[PDB]
Design an enzyme around this catalytic site. Structure first.
Site, PDB file in Angstrom:
ATOM      1  NE  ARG E  87      -3.419   2.796   0.548  1.00 40.32           N
ATOM      2  CZ  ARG E  87      -3.056   3.954  -0.006  1.00 40.32           C
ATOM      3  NH1 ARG E  87      -2.035   4.016  -0.856  1.00 40.32           N
ATOM      4  NH2 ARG E  87      -3.731   5.060   0.277  1.00 40.32           N
ATOM      5  CG  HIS E  90      -0.940   6.617   2.123  1.00 44.50           C
ATOM      6  ND1 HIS E  90      -0.601   5.281   2.172  1.00 44.50           N
ATOM      7  CD2 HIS E  90      -1.864   6.802   3.098  1.00 44.50           C
ATOM      8  CE1 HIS E  90      -1.304   4.682   3.120  1.00 44.50           C
ATOM      9  NE2 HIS E  90      -2.076   5.585   3.700  1.00 44.50           N
ATOM     10  CG  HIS E  92      -4.697   9.290   5.587  1.00 43.92           C
ATOM     11  ND1 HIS E  92      -4.821   8.304   4.623  1.00 43.92           N
ATOM     12  CD2 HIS E  92      -4.167   8.684   6.673  1.00 43.92           C
ATOM     13  CE1 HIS E  92      -4.367   7.163   5.104  1.00 43.92           C
ATOM     14  NE2 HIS E  92      -3.956   7.367   6.344  1.00 43.92           N
ATOM     15  CD  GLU E  96      -4.129   4.100   8.167  1.00 51.03           C
ATOM     16  OE1 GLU E  96      -3.923   5.112   7.480  1.00 51.03           O
ATOM     17  OE2 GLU E  96      -3.683   2.976   7.872  1.00 51.03           O
ATOM     18  CG  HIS E 135       0.836   5.725   7.158  1.00 49.35           C
ATOM     19  ND1 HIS E 135       0.393   7.010   7.418  1.00 49.35           N
ATOM     20  CD2 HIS E 135      -0.215   5.063   6.616  1.00 49.35           C
ATOM     21  CE1 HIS E 135      -0.877   7.108   7.063  1.00 49.35           C
ATOM     22  NE2 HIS E 135      -1.273   5.938   6.583  1.00 49.35           N
ATOM     23  CD  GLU E 157      -6.939   4.132   2.050  1.00 49.75           C
ATOM     24  OE1 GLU E 157      -7.639   3.827   3.033  1.00 49.75           O
ATOM     25  OE2 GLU E 157      -5.688   4.155   2.110  1.00 49.75           O
ATOM     26  CG  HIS E 268     -22.455  -1.424  27.818  1.00 50.89           C
ATOM     27  ND1 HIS E 268     -22.841  -2.521  27.072  1.00 50.89           N
ATOM     28  CD2 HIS E 268     -21.607  -0.715  27.031  1.00 50.89           C
ATOM     29  CE1 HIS E 268     -22.242  -2.479  25.893  1.00 50.89           C
ATOM     30  NE2 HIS E 268     -21.487  -1.395  25.844  1.00 50.89           N
ATOM     31  CG  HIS E 270     -19.809   3.377  25.446  1.00 44.42           C
ATOM     32  ND1 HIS E 270     -18.922   2.570  26.125  1.00 44.42           N
ATOM     33  CD2 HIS E 270     -20.462   2.575  24.575  1.00 44.42           C
ATOM     34  CE1 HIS E 270     -19.011   1.340  25.660  1.00 44.42           C
ATOM     35  NE2 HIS E 270     -19.937   1.316  24.717  1.00 44.42           N
ATOM     36  CD  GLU E 275     -19.912  -0.010  21.067  1.00 52.39           C
ATOM     37  OE1 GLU E 275     -19.720   0.289  22.274  1.00 52.39           O
ATOM     38  OE2 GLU E 275     -20.389  -1.116  20.703  1.00 52.39           O
ATOM     39  CG  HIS E 314     -24.947  -0.306  23.268  1.00 47.89           C
ATOM     40  ND1 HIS E 314     -24.636   0.880  23.905  1.00 47.89           N
ATOM     41  CD2 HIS E 314     -23.763  -0.915  23.015  1.00 47.89           C
ATOM     42  CE1 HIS E 314     -23.325   0.975  24.041  1.00 47.89           C
ATOM     43  NE2 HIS E 314     -22.770  -0.105  23.514  1.00 47.89           N
TER      44      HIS E 314
HETATM   45 CO   LIG Z   1     -20.603  -0.457  24.012  1.00 44.55          CO
HETATM   46 CO   LIG Z   2      -3.074   5.228   5.573  1.00 42.98          CO
END
Ligand SMILES: [Co+2]
Ligand SMILES: [Co+2]
Ligand SMILES: [Co+2]
Ligand SMILES: [Co+2]
Ligand SMILES: [Co+2]
Ligand SMILES: [Co+2]
Ligand SMILES: [Co+2]
Ligand SMILES: [Co+2]
Ligand SMILES: [Co+2]
Ligand SMILES: [Co+2]
EC number: 4.1.1.2
Lengths: 377, 377, 377, 377, 377
Positions: E87, E90, E92, E96, E135, E157, E268, E270, E275, E314
């Protein structure tokens, strides 16, 4: 000599490195009228300050909302074609309006009912392509240079829809099935867009005309603006084309204005919409009055784009020794203005005097007829 | 006595310092109906809660989107003029609609073709100025107080375009060249706007009329609303003015509603657009039904602005012993409602009974004729 | 008597039906100072103008961005509980800050490490619940009434996450599997939310404390604001709580201000963020200075919300004969202000004189110590 | 066998757990044409991937902007009714358009003038309800299943306005005063909405018709689409209904397209607006050409929603052995396309050859008549 | 067999052509729990429904805001590389994060101080590349397949910054001057980007390491997630990596969850952020509780993306006979949750009983220790 941002007891010499050339082109910005006040958006951008896309056969450069953010509804391309060169068959989301500044060109367009219109345009002619309708431009023996105006500020002309680009990104199986030919027969389709490309000169207009089972278009897509009778006042001329005379031009109203030296487009505003301007030739200044004691003056010369937001008061004054010639563009189905002079002339003189703290000697000069362009005595 | 937010077994006395006066003006807010539910935007604001701009000759105060954010398309000014006082010649981006609550005034307007209209208005009359067209208001011998409504919520009337302000921010050289006079002749122009200013009473209407080479306006900009025949039902009266009768009023439809004590504007909604309200006199409550089990009740009295978003169900109930009188305003080319009563009366009775779990004794009282205002038995 | 919007020769009597009681509450709005100018957003709203949600055990009413649109970052709920009544276990996306105006309550909270904090709060105490952490409020013997502030103006209290509502909308099989019980053992779960419900008084605080394996929370979630030493100046007291002293209060800084009759919170601004205000008792006026020659004065009394956008100049003057008590709330990790007086006092006196065109007799009165509340001499 | 994302020397086998079924339904996505390029929004969503709301009497599930964000102007509900079952009397802000896929149903509607229209619809019929106008649907003896399309992407059908919901949230005193009945008489009103509910079959259409003092509606709200003469080309059929034939359908234009195996909806675009699609039956692929060398291919089968933003080039190809049948929906007052084939056929052959680098053997096959659906040779 | 949207007396058979395979994948959408209610956005999307970009050496497909609009802050790419395939180098704008599902790869990165880190990652390892740092990824002997997550939902991408693409669009004179070489020495630069390209295997890691004058990076950019001790509870395992243990991972917190047949990730929420989920293997259902009585259940399997907006309740239930393995991703500097069970267990049991209308037999089962995965008894 070397101009300084100084006006009476105000301002000071520039002590840092500066752009003297540009300062000389902007005397009413380096040194605004004392009557300017407050924050007003920029209303001026030069095509000379844009990236020019060069192709075999000509060029194209644009002023969009990314250059001039006040103009959200209108954008423009300055396009040049060598003799015979073709602006490739294409379409866009925006409606397109054009003025031929130099030379001549042949246009094609096919409407939603499959009817074609093919015609030549010369200097001072217009064309208009409704949104979504596909078209082309080909310059004749002198070549051509013209102004395109699009009815969305976000326009980009590296991003319109090209015939060869569409085909280059359609599966071959699909192109072959669409037309009833083999994959072999379309093997030579270009693998990329052409945009602008060189080509031999076209034959007679008469021999390009294509007959259809759907008949002729009901209204032409070209218009001979300079062949109409202008509104003539003392210091100049105004040719208007909107949807009332140029029938197809539903979303764009235009006026070409000529102002002799010592003359000005009079004080007025537009009660309908924003004004977008292109300065063909000459030199001007304009003050935009933005309400609430806000006003800013701008300078303009050949190659400049100007703008006046909806309902703001303005005038356009020739400040050079040559004719001043500019286009006014409106995204609307008709041209309309309110003239300051005519407005006051149609009201009782005592009422006007009460407002202005002036007497009969002022109100006597008011005129009930509209003279868009006036000349200094 | 002292009201408490208590309803049956719900609520409790207030234990903190409070605004008892305001609580008394809002009994359906301190103590909502049990049928209210869920989050609904505020639909009520008082002109008494706005800053009043005082000038020599009167005053003006506004309710805009900055006071009442639900009303994004409509804003309003309550303006007062002493005898002879003039609301200075000006224009705006917005169209303007008005109702004369008290006194009388003379208006002027010049349209895009340079044609003038000058007329007097009295109590119960309307005027309408299309966007961008310049105008003025001058109160006659009794003075005047009226409601202005503008078709953009963001309006501000410290920010419209004034004649003297425009001139105060245009270079003198330009003003002189525009009119063909010397800088000397305009030396006495005011250096700032007037907005509202005192002036002697005007002469006869007949002597103010100005003749033009462009002829008379095709439709008047004033309208005598109270001289029309109202829709009359049991507990009140409805006078409607939209673009079908008041021809120039293209963007604003209005109704003046009178509701006797013990009566109500019946359950209905508008299938076209939002409703904006002004309460001229009396006391009301209204529940706005916002779908998905959401409803909130509001209280209103003289000087209040109200609102009902597009298609939401509502009624307006007189909860006092005096007549309830209010304006309904719509940004559209016509008035339209759907009456709950008439809707159900035009459907098969078995079908309605199946919905409502009620019998023939309910559906028998349904009426196929529309009675906007109904009185309790 | 009957106030009129008249100031010297400016203004006129109100000729239309009006809200005289509200006018008496807003004298500096009916007759603003002549130093006021220009368009400024509404900075004032009354809890008395809001829909009161009534339940068995108390009530809740709110002022949010839907009522006061200038306040986009902060919203508030006035909540009342009868003795023993419980505001149901719930959580929200917003952090929550609270001031106890009347009575006393028990709060619970559990943090992200599974640790619980349970405490009692009385008059003048605060609590703070970080975003997303679950909590409850239960009134003690006297009942409780308090002000909640949430760090998003878009808040609605009908739309937070309630315990029983969560269980009611989770499949019974899942609740059963979650706790290792049968569907029958949870058949008596409430079919809907409670929100606020009646209950017997809890026992002593010491017998409610729940020990667990993750230990004590590092910082308490309550704070005794009135037990701190206030900043005392001539005409009042200021008690400040922000993240520097009330350690968990990361997103809300607060001050309780008391201003004696004839005194004022001095001219100042906040270099950090907007100010949100609640008026607990008394009567005030404040002018908000918005730059560029814009300022607007507002009146406030018990039950009112106020606002001052970031960096705008302001003062809060007591205009009644009783003490003026209000909260200042900021969405930031600390309280900060610049005092106009202290600022000028820290500059060379001749520099200050050159600005203000005043002499030594003025600069001699300037004070280098900050006195947030000053008393009229 | 097991498909892999491999095309010539490109791609690779999948090494992680995968959804082989879905991969088989999306062969042109797992393995796009080499001619696809660049980022394009998702243009495909299945009703099978939505939450289905089940009621006594049927069901309803929706694809909105919350599922398919490219479609901001159009949303859809797939609704099913058992025999006699009633979709409760209601209204919305959006206009509604419908196609009867299975069975039959009776609709009611009352317009702004209080006039009723009641009619039955069968398979292949349409109905259209203007925004704000109240209506109902009741399935006859076979039951019914149909597609609803609404002219706002943000639509939600748990959030429309229901008759019984409105009444459940209006004070009883108000309902009683509105109709002139006692609170006792309305005691049995449902305490909540019904939405969809079971009911006995209705009697004859003839006996449901309700006579009014306001007369008959000027245009019907139903339309028999399949009874019109289709545009017939080699590989299929096109039935168009827009505001020029289905008079009431002002905001929605539709076409039902049938494509035989080995056939395709030809290459074209729409110069007016966005296309929204529903796939009734069969299997297709479509490439959306987005300009600037961007193109993405999508797969579709029964139950899928598709989309084509304004002016983007597309085709719809049958890739199965059964008929492909789909709806095209446009938010506009008329259907319009530009056919690639017909466009080029109406231009001089030399000009086309110059673009495409192809000869007379290509341009000879071009056709000046439009054939929306073409079949492979 | 053939599932139908029927639950007891609610629902009806599907009468129109349908996607039976997709219906079998979504049983809790075709027949949702009766505890579901109201409008909730789509929280589910399949990588199988996305366009797969195929290159020599592997493939890349993505789920972004254009596919799943509820996910505005996070986007994902499923990327596959053949042995040795690279890959391209490059960078961004987004940070990531990555999880290696199959095989192994070598990564490179250079930080802002010019220091390089090169390392190998195998199954179950992570890497993280801070925003803007350059990277590359190169597969080892087995090839590699992995999941990339980017901290902006608007990611594409096709639009990151590639090395060769940068050089291809930089003037040759400038590249020459930049490196102190001639135009001829760089004439063989690729004329376009590679993106993914084939290559021989690299040598040992030890012989790739590049020493330099700025020293070693302070923290590694890879992390061995499966080599840590997981949280083990009855029905599964949770492995967490956030900035507290994987030090460079400042903007992404992650958890890998394994859930045995008959087990569930407990109820639970957050308190910190949204998420984002990826389902690696297995079959699940989740109900998202959205407050105000709104909840919606979704089904997931291998290849699916899931989402849970901030603070919504959830659980994730394994509904198959194989282990359920998924990632939970959060745009924050730490993982945090509140467990429903642990929460109630930390409150006085009688307070909990008063809420839930259950007795001691229920509160006795509550656990003070957090067990994120519970097994059905
Ligand atoms: Co969760
Ligand atoms: Co990348
Ligand atoms: Co063009
Ligand atoms: Co103009
Ligand atoms: Co006006
Ligand atoms: Co109404
Ligand atoms: Co709370
Ligand atoms: Co302050
Ligand atoms: Co409907
Ligand atoms: Co189409």
């Amino acid at each position: 000599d070397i101009p300084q941002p100084i006006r009476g007891d105000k301002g000071a010499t520039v002590k840092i490195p500066r752009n003297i050339e540009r300062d000389r082109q902007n005397p009413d910005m380096l040194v605004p009228p004392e009557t300017d006040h407050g924050t007003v958006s920029n209303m001026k951008f030069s095509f000379s300050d844009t990236h020019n896309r060069l192709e075999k056969g000509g060029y194209a450069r644009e002023v969009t909302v990314r250059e001039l953010p006040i103009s959200e509804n209108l954008a423009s391309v300055n396009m040049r074609l060598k003799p015979g060169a073709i602006r490739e068959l294409h379409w866009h989301k925006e409606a397109e309006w054009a003025y031929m500044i130099y030379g001549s060109a042949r246009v094609t367009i096919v409407d939603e009912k499959g009817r074609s219109f093919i015609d030549d345009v010369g200097e001072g002619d217009l064309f208009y392509f409704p949104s979504g309708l596909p078209h082309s431009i080909q310059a004749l023996e002198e070549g051509a240079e013209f102004l395109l105006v699009f009815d969305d500020g976000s326009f980009s002309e590296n991003s319109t829809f090209q015939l060869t680009d569409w085909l280059a990104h359609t599966p071959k199986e699909v192109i072959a099935a669409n037309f009833g030919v083999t994959k072999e027969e379309i093997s030579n389709l270009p693998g990329k867009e052409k945009y602008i490309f060189e080509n031999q000169l076209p034959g007679s207009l008469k021999d390009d005309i294509v007959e259809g089972p759907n008949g002729e278009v009901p209204y032409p897509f070209t218009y001979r603006l300079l062949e109409q009778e202008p509104i003539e006042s003392e210091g100049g001329k105004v040719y208007i084309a909107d949807s009332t005379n140029f029938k197809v031009s539903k979303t764009i109203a235009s006026a070409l204005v000529t102002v002799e030296p010592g003359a000005m487009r009079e004080l007025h505003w537009h009660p309908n919409t924003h004004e977008w301007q292109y300065y063909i030739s000459g030199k001007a200044r304009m003050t935009v009055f933005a309400s609430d004691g806000h006003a800013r003056t701008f300078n303009y010369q050949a190659g400049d784009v100007g703008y006046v937001p909806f309902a703001m008061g303005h005038y356009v004054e020739n400040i050079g020794d040559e004719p001043l010639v500019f286009l006014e563009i409106f995204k609307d189905d008709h041209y309309a203005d309110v003239s300051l002079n005519q407005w006051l002339a149609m009201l009782p003189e005592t009422f006007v005097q009460a407002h202005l703290d002036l007497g009969k000697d002022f109100t006597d000069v008011l005129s009930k007829e509209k003279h868009p362009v006036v000349k200094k005595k």
